[PDB]
Amino acid sequence: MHVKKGDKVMVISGKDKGKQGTILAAFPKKDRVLVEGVNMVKKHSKPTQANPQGGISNQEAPIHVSNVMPLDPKTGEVTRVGYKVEDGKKVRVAKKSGQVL
Amino acid sequence: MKANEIRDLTTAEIEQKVKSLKEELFNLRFQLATGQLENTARIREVRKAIARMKTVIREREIAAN
């Protein structure tokens, strides 16, 4: 997908609209993307093996990649993505900007 | 890893290191059967290793042939 693990991204649709977040997950098997601070589900938790706790765990939940584009690192608005090569390895270059990633 | 089984000596040293890591693999199966082994990825990598080497030896001999 156009997004990668470890990217600063911006979300479009859903209840969470127009909020910043970082990426620490990726699911290319299902185009499924977990962003920080979005889809704030509250999972019911039983004790886990020898862990003696019982409660509701409030944690992240992943969203679809089609609702996420990354931002321009220069101007800061959400921008479209293009592909370009730079001295051997190809690089991810956002549209309407010359900067990479 | 991949290069070294070609870059080392032709046939000879491969045979005793073959039965060396076959001894090692045998030890992993023994200790897994008694339930003590930890690195379960070793039981995949040693048997892969063997195929790696076997194929190079076999190609080598057909290439010499």
Binding site: - | K19, E23, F26
Partner: protein
């Protein structure tokens, strides 16, 4: 063929633990392996002397999970009776 493959894994039961006291050992071996090459294999690789070898093979137990009705592996179990004052095994 290669002696390091002819016996696959030992089996640890209460019966097995009983027999290691009186110096008979239990092993699961290859299906094609017969009474004698397991013996030559074991003194070749263990430095031990073994007097009598008994052999028996188990067919797979039928076993059910979910909705599938598969068959577990056919096994061949070997009993090796060491001689007197022979060395021990891990």
């Amino acid at each position: 063929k290669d002696p390091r493959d002819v016996l696959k894994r030992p089996v640890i039961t209460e019966r097995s633990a009983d027999l290691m006291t009186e110096k008979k050992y239990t092993f699961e071996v290859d299906v094609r392996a017969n009474k004698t090459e397991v013996k030559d294999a074991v003194e070749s690789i263990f430095g031990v002397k073994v007097d009598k070898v008994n052999i028996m093979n188990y067919k797979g137990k039928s076993k059910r999970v979910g909705r599938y009705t598969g068959m577990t592996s056919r096994r061949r179990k070997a009993i090796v009776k060491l001689t007197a004052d022979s060395k021990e095994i891990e």
